[PDB]
Design a protein around this ligand. Structure first.
Ligand code: ZN
Ligand code: ZN
Lengths: 422, 291, 141, 422, 291
């Protein structure tokens, strides 16, 4: 088809302040027209009667495990989970093996992702060579090859001068630093420093490890004029510190893992190692703080931190790899904020689309005329379960395995081409 | 006893008078100054020391050389005591190059019966290199007024930039800087500078670009990831050569780091002119201080 | 040390660089009913001689970043909040430092601070008038 | 075009024992028919009247400098030189940066080469991790990703047990070891141990460094049953040792650099650093031995060892990088063996086509019906010069820079598609 | 600009003309050459540098010294850039001693407005030492024609042998070598040499023996087992003294390795004569190049 029409659906493009029941004409992979009752003879038709139409989702925090750990996930299985969950753009983390610290690894990922052809995969580079924390990586070669941000995820940068230098060089290049904030002297145990660690004697990770580094990062972003993006906020104090710096005009953004919105440290008692994550699931008071942070606009976007690990890496909590999968599970997770009247639907969509697009400085997350036809089509009320029938990840590491989910992607359209169908 | 420590201490008239002498010396003026000079190169810099030495000798000044400090580091002995020893030995001039910042200096200079010539003090000043760069630019264009002069590289550690920028400013040129953002002082506005993030934009704006020597040390200090990435981001590459109007480079070139190995001697390069202008400018400084 | 008569613990004029060490010191000191006095200046960002400002740019003297102080003040207020210890910030020299201290005071955190009358009188330009007699940690800003 | 015809040309396919004046029909990238006077309406036509038609050349020894030294050459500039010199398949060496010792580097090269689309680029992996000589590389992952051989080029393997182990594992996988034979205790200087080193006092590389390692490799290939391929033979004793093992049925092959056929150590006196190469140009007696080795079938193929270095890496012989470029210069270099009545034209072609194809175990170097249409078309008498007008390499490091060459490629056809035209 | 890089570039006439000047300078000829020279001794060699320096100064040439390279190793800076800096500083002569082989050199030399004098380049050439050794032998015997001249020691690494042997050959002398077989180039026949395995046989054949300095490094490199065994096998011992006709030694003597500690100054030794002839030969070289 030269021409596609998304018919009958309820359109929400928050970046344009557009809502209502419109059809969308796509041509040559781009948004052509948005208008009431559109028709062109033998233009291809997608029927979205009864469904929500919005811009393709953007997840700025995904581990594709490719190269080097592709038994956990790869670019193809990752890009399948992505599109199955409404994502037309994802940003992959650099903690692969070999790490993303040279242009050969960058180019391998770009070309492989181009072959898989489902989903835009945007790489990030490391902050330090090998993520070893000792020498700054080659920001310039890396940015020029296509990196959109620098992170040492899942390691913190412990030397403040290193973080200061990375922010300077990255800002000079017009790109953000994404920081995994967790001081390694205060966070080397396995779960939250709270009631479960006290009860069971599992080693703990202090909330202050995260807060100390957030405060540091906001100060450095203020002093350097760099843009820092805080990767996974998990406490109330963290959100109070972020807002302290936002209110001063500092370029600091943050994201929330839908898992910290659903679950507390007690999930360790119900899901064992499938609740092991960095930073940890905290207390009830922090969970509710995060929800209030999403409601009151402190948190800029949702980002899954899709972190696949095999089942043998998820047995005894003490020895488990930290991480939870979440690409396919993000939408219905966000949707219970909507059902509970905490956020509007528009607001939910912002946080999956234009908000993350502006954080990485990409012209996506939009249905503006002329922009690429990255479109997501969903049913906020349709039920399903993530199990062996529906799981597209090579891994299963989620406290939501086997639970009933409400809200589901019916179609994912990437550059005018359908890439996922329910 | 007159001294030359800092470009910030020079008035317009003084710069005019030094550059007038420099031009006469370049045109073949001869003069005898019956004096002795000690060249005290605690920090060695062969090129600069040979230039001060040959300038002095061609004026009939007897030169004495202390180099490396001759194993540097006399423990318990200050810089002041060393200078005071030179005074006791009856030297008229002390040309000194030291790895530390000589500050404050006014009161020490006042207390010594010596003509002190700063040949580089750490990261602070290098007045003769400032003047040489100014003279070279002026020889080429006639006037420096309204010229757009871009310095590229390690501005933070640059005594050459700190000596040249104020001279060029004083005579109406416009200064720009471009380098790793980690190496640009936060208050570089004290020098009244345009700041370019991107060296290509800097090259398009500039009448003349002065590449500053990148020291390998900066990589280990984490200011840059590597020398070859620095070359790609900031250096004079073959692709940039087509766009550059004219360029200079103060110290010895760090080839394929600062400037492409093929681009040191070209019709756009004033690098060899700066080497040539060093002796006449340094003769002018000796002469200027012989009052 | 407390039993012999010490009224507070400080590594002045050195910072404590390991946050777990500072956290531990606050815990043990609070258990004893005494404060920690902290010289806040991250040694990776403050190893030069004067303020990172106009005088350092002009003269090329090595500098001490204001963020070295702020980063450690923020750290100390967070640790005092989480441990319930009392931290006393030894010599505040920037506006951001005071905004961070007040952020934690307003939460009921036991954080106090003091000012050196010299930071009230003098800026980094005093280095140009008094030379080494204006050299101090943290610097005149 | 569905259909192509190479008309009027003199066909030589030695693998099939085919010579004479035939036309070739190509369809869907494959050799369809070979026959006297062929015609199909509006099938595309290449006029080869007065020219030699043969299988596309295969060079089993090329440095593409990609990744990591792409200021010297890259996959694109390399593949341009290749096709301009008659090559439709080249084998790249693993001494890149990062080295070819993991599948990410392999895949980067395969996908990049696929984009450039001129020339089949077949990677090799290292023998040891990092080419550091200490640990065997992952032969299995590397072979499975597409490596066709293992070499530590341009380093020797000094530990015989390592070389023995590599041969065992590689033979188990059905692939050869390519060895750079030069004992590093006897070859650490810059030029041949001969008259030029004695005269000038330049440090030397003993011929025995090469011979000792050739002998070692033939013994190990005999004992393990592995296939070893000797990369660049330069002495008469080397050829006597290789033949000693061939005569016993040992799977040992070798190649010659056309530069060792043209030039002796005295070229160091005429071209300076452009004559610096590993192993070095030897004496007149060795040069003539090599030619006799080519004539009498001891040497199995030509392989350029295309080794680009910049001009600043080629000044004082003492400090120069070793290597000479040769992709574009191989044909006319070989052609003076033909003009001097040393080899037949058929024999020349064998050594560029079916001989190297059998060494790497690939079904190419042939115009058999059904095989890919990799065809080279040349003029054995046409003169030209390698200079700034004709050079496709980013480098110029050859003693033949500015010399008149005789013999030239008019067309290169890769999979039925024209990729180079004179 | 004339240069002297290699003994292989000298014609008979040129050697005749240099040695004629050397003899006049030895006999007390005075001359003024109004020039400057930089002595660039990257590899230090006090004895050779003092000899070139005193030769130059006695001719009125102003000399400037760069020694150790003054901490060698300017990273990114070539030998060419250093020479090109000397040219920009206006030096007439560059006397250089470097630890690498300067080859190829023809085209670099042609591109520079400098009189280059090779005072030793690695293991390649040392033309003035060749000439000094030739001159010393010639002063003693009148002519070198038909003399049997034996070099003993590390021939492979010897720039002195590479500079002297071709001069002696050009004038009809016969060269022999004797040393550890590990230190004799396999194609030493390029110099048209007799090779002796045994130093005693070499001593019996020779009119004059030139002991080459053995470097302690050669032991660690496994070319020799020890210095004291080398002395026993190849050195001038007291027992060999009775048989030796006459002998020389270019650098500083490695006592009880090359030559017995008692045998440095004897009536058979021309060692001190070579030291004496260095200044007049080096004056002759400056003069030869002043055209
Ligand atoms: Zn992550
Ligand atoms: Zn090779």
């Amino acid at each position: 088809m030269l021409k596609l029409i998304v018919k009958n659906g309820y359109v929400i493009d928050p970046s344009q302040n557009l809502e209502g029941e419109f059809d969308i004409l796509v041509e040559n992979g781009k948004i052509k027209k948005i208008d009431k009752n559109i028709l062109v003879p033998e233009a291809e038709i997608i029927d979205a009667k009864g469904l929500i139409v919005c811009p393709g989702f953007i997840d700025i925090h995904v581990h594709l495990r490719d190269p080097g750990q592709t038994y956990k996930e790869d670019i193809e299985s990752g890009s399948r989970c992505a599109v199955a969950g409404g994502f037309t753009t994802i940003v992959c983390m650099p903690n692969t093996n070999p790490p993303i610290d040279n242009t050969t690894v960058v180019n391998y990922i770009l070309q492989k992702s181009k072959s898989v052809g489902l989903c835009r995969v945007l790489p990030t580079g490391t902050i330090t060579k090998g993520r070893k924390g000792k020498e700054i990586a080659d920001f310039y070669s890396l940015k020029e090859a296509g990196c959109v941000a620098f992170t040492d995820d899942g390691s913190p940068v412990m030397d403040s001068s290193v973080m200061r230098k990375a922010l300077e060089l990255a800002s000079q290049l017009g790109v953000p630093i994404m920081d995994h904030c967790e001081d390694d002297k205060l966070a080397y145990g396995v779960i939250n420093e709270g009631e479960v660690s006290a009860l069971l004697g599992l080693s703990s990770r202090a909330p202050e490890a995260e807060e100390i580094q957030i405060a540091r990062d906001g100060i450095l972003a203020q002093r350097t004029g760099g843009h820092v993006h805080i990767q996974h906020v998990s406490t109330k104090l963290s959100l109070e510190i972020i807002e302290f710096f936002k209110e001063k005009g500092v370029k600091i953004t943050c994201e929330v893992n839908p898992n910290h919105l659903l679950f507390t440290e007690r999930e360790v008692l119900n899901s064992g190692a499938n609740a092991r994550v960095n930073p940890p699931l905290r207390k009830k008071e922090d969970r509710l703080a995060l929800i209030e942070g999403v409601k009151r606009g402190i948190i800029d976007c949702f980002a899954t931190d899709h972190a696949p690990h095999q089942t043998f890496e998820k047995e005894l909590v003490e020895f488990a790899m930290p991480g939870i999968i979440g690409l396919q599970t993000a939408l219905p997770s966000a949707l219970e904020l909507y059902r509970k009247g905490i956020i509007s639907l528009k607001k939910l969509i912002e946080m999956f689309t234009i908000n993350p697009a502006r954080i990485i400085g990409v012209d996506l997350g939009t249905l503006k005329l002329g922009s690429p036809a990255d479109i997501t089509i969903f049913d906020p009320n349709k039920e399903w379960i993530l199990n062996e029938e529906t799981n597209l990840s090579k891994s299963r590491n989620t406290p939501l395995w086997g639970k009933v989910l409400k809200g589901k992607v019916i179609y994912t359209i990437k550059d005018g081409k359908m890439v996922y169908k329910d | 006893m007159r001294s030359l420590i800092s470009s910030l201490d020079l008035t317009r008239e003084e710069v005019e008078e030094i550059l007038k002498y420099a031009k006469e010396f370049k045109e073949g003026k001869e003069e005898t100054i019956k004096a002795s000079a000690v060249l005290f190169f605690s920090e060695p810099s062969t090129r600069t020391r040979l230039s001060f030495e040959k300038a002095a000798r061609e004026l009939g000044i007897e030169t004495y050389l202390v180099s490396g400090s001759e194993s540097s580091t006399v423990k318990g002995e200050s810089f002041f005591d060393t200078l005071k020893t030179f005074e006791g030995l009856g030297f008229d001039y002390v040309v000194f190059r030291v790895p530390f910042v000589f500050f404050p200096y006014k009161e020490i200079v006042k207390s010594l019966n010596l003509r002190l010539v700063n040949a580089g003090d750490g990261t602070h000043q290098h007045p003769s290199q400032g003047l040489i760069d100014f003279f070279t630019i002026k020889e080429h264009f006639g006037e420096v007024k309204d010229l757009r002069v871009l310095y590229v590289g390690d501005i933070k550690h640059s005594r050459v930039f700190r000596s040249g920028a104020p001279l060029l400013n004083m005579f109406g040129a416009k200064i720009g800087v471009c380098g790793p953002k980690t190496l640009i002082p936060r208050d570089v506005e004290v020098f009244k500078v345009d700041v370019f993030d991107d060296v290509d934009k800097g090259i398009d704006w500039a009448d003349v670009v002065i590449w500053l020597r990148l020291q390998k040390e900066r990589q280990k200090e984490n200011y840059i990831p590597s020398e070859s990435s620095y070359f790609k981001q900031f250096g004079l590459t073959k692709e940039r050569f087509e766009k550059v109007k004219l360029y200079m480079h103060p110290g010895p070139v760090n080839r394929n780091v600062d400037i492409d190995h093929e681009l040191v001697y070209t019709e756009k390069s004033l690098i060899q002119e700066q080497v040539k202008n060093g002796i006449p400018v340094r003769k002018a400084i000796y002469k200027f201080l012989w009052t």
